[PDB]
Ligand binder design. Structure first.
Ligand SMILES: *[C@@H]1O[C@H](CO)[C@@H](O)[C@H](O)[C@H]1NC(C)=O
Lengths: 215, 227, 71, 49
């Protein structure tokens, strides 16, 4: 698990410090450009959260589409590939395991890449690596049958390819089974998304102190 | 060789054109100049603020006030010019760490791509890497990642192994490819088929296990020499 | 005109339907001149092409282009 | 800046392990690498090495 972005929160300086007062502002004008300076800092990192998600996901040119028939040599991808019932299955469990309001000057600009887009990039990244393998990252996406791809990755770590075919049926079962335990280990054990939850906890705890200080 | 040299020579040509014509081509280097100079500007503009004293020019508050009372106003400037100078320093210590993160990334891209051919995917340009060329710049560095990109693909029919004499035959370095009528092996990234002799396949076990193989003939070069 | 988004109420742009590669990010998936008017549309991820998977068919390139990006 | 250090690490783990098979030791999961699968998440990314 890795965080890639925080909430694009933004705060209006003068409305926080003064809060719709004419007497206070004309004082705040004496402190030079502190108000202008912070406001620029906060929209400097708000516009950067859009560059973070635009780098992790937007790595591909065209949005590949997974085929209708799924004959992946015995490998069962039902868990990761998208399900049109609603976004993928495992992804749907991830969106349930987190617990993600404005008062005065505070706000939350919405992220540029909507979640049903972010969920779409991660489908092309899935349909290229299932069908094409390495190549959709290097240029024109060449297709290669999956059961043959894993043979060409076994040839990576130093295992001659004969091992796969000669064990294809079992290997597919281990892989299919290993994927199964994931959602179980994810669903059962709470505190499985410790990393993403902090970046939500901290960044929201920090906002809380900002408002408490108004009192 | 002759064509490859032309593509490379030509590709280098378009660079200066794309660089000269399209302004905003050095967006990255220009910001680090813009920001870091914009930030200095605000530091000086802050010298003209009252912070609540009678006047923002330390000479006048000093020119027309007795020392006991003056330092009460001078204190309101010092307490401000300090907080505004210590704000500038902090934003630089943060901004410099963003550059030491890039200076370290350029120290790597030069050691990993100029001083060698990097196997990392998509580290040095989109595509399989061939080489790279440093170029200085005002305050940065510019790499010219010369990369190999395939094109003009054609569909073929594949088969994981070749069952010959009951034994399977797996490709040593290649993929078993057929133009419909004749089967071949070829390097996996550039169409160049060849006749399936024995020295480009290796054998293992009978051909009942692995699904998808086809029945074919692997010719032995030793046999035409026995006769 | 007046057009409503998830980010807010956007007046001055004429909403359209065909997607483009987006120019001026606005928010919630919506971006924003094209022929003397300001158009506010949905981002496109790019041309959607799903490649023809088989269980027995590979596709191998026959020519390349050595190209020079910058960085 | 702590997140731009992770966003950059995820931008690498996707280019080095989803778009290829990485030879770096222990970069993509304990063991010799075979492949990886992105999965979106609320504000992050989840890889299935
Ligand atoms: C876009 O499509 C919607 C639904 O089909 C339609 O109501 C709307 O008029 C269209 N907008 C334009 C500008 O044609």
């Amino acid at each position: 698990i890795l965080p890639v972005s925080m909430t694009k929160t933004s705060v209006d300086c003068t409305m926080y410090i003064c809060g719709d007062s004419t007497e206070c502002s004309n004082l705040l004008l004496q402190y030079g450009s502190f108000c202008t300076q912070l406001n620029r800092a906060l929209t400097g990192i708000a516009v950067e959260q859009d560059k973070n998600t635009q780098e992790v996901f937007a790595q591909v040119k065209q949005i590949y589409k997974t085929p209708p028939i799924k004959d992946f040599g015995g490998f069962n991808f039902s868990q990761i590939l998208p399900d049109p019932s609603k976004r993928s299955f495992i992804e749907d469990l991830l969106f349930n395991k987190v617990t993600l309001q404005k008062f005065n000057g505070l706000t939350v600009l919405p992220p540029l890449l909507t979640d049903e887009m972010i969920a779409q990039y991660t489908s092309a990244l899935l349909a290229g690596t299932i069908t094409s393998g390495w190549t959709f990252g290097a240029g024109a996406a060449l297709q290669i049958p999956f059961a043959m791809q894993m043979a060409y990755r076994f040839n990576g770590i130093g295992v001659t390819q004969n091992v796969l075919y000669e064990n294809q049926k079992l290997i597919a079962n281990q892989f299919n089974s290993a994927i199964g335990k994931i959602q179980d280990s994810l669903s059962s054990t709470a505190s499985a998304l410790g990393k993403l939850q902090d970046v939500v906890n901290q960044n929201a705890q920090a906002l809380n102190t900002l408002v408490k200080q108004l009192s | 060789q002759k064509l490859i040299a032309n593509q490379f020579n030509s590709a280098i040509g378009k660079i200066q054109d794309s660089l000269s014509s399209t302004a905003s081509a050095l967006g990255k280097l220009q910001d680090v100049v813009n920001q870091n100079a914009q930030a200095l500007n605000t530091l000086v503009k802050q010298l003209s603020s009252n912070f609540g004293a009678i006047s923002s020019v330390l000479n006048d508050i000093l020119s027309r006030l007795d020392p006991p009372e003056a330092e009460v106003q001078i204190d309101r400037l010092i307490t401000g010019r300090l907080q505004s100078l210590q704000t500038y320093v902090t934003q630089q210590l943060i901004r410099a760490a963003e550059i030491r993160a890039s200076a370290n990334l350029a120290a790597t891209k030069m050691s990993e791509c100029v001083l060698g051919q990097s196997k990392r995917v998509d580290f040095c340009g989109k595509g399989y890497h061939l080489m790279s060329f440093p170029q200085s710049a005002p305050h940065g560095v510019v790499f010219l990642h010369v990369t190999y990109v395939p094109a003009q693909e054609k569909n073929f029919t594949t088969a994981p192994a070749i069952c010959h004499d009951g034994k399977a035959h797996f490709p040593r370095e290649g993929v078993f490819v057929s133009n419909g009528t004749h089967w071949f092996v070829t390097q996996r990234n550039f169409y160049e088929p060849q006749i399936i002799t024995t020295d480009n396949t290796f054998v293992s076990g009978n051909c009942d296990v692995v699904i998808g193989i086809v029945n074919n003939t692997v010719y032995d070069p030793l046999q035409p020499e026995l006769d | 005109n007046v057009f409503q988004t998830r980010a807010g109420c956007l007046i001055g742009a004429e909403h359209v339907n065909n997607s483009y590669e987006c120019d001026i990010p606005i928010g919630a998936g919506i971006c924003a001149v094209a022929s003397q008017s300001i158009i506010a549309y949905t981002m496109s991820l790019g041309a959607e092409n799903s490649v023809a998977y088989s269980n027995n068919s590979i596709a191998i390139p026959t020519n390349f282009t050595i190209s020079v990006t910058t960085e």
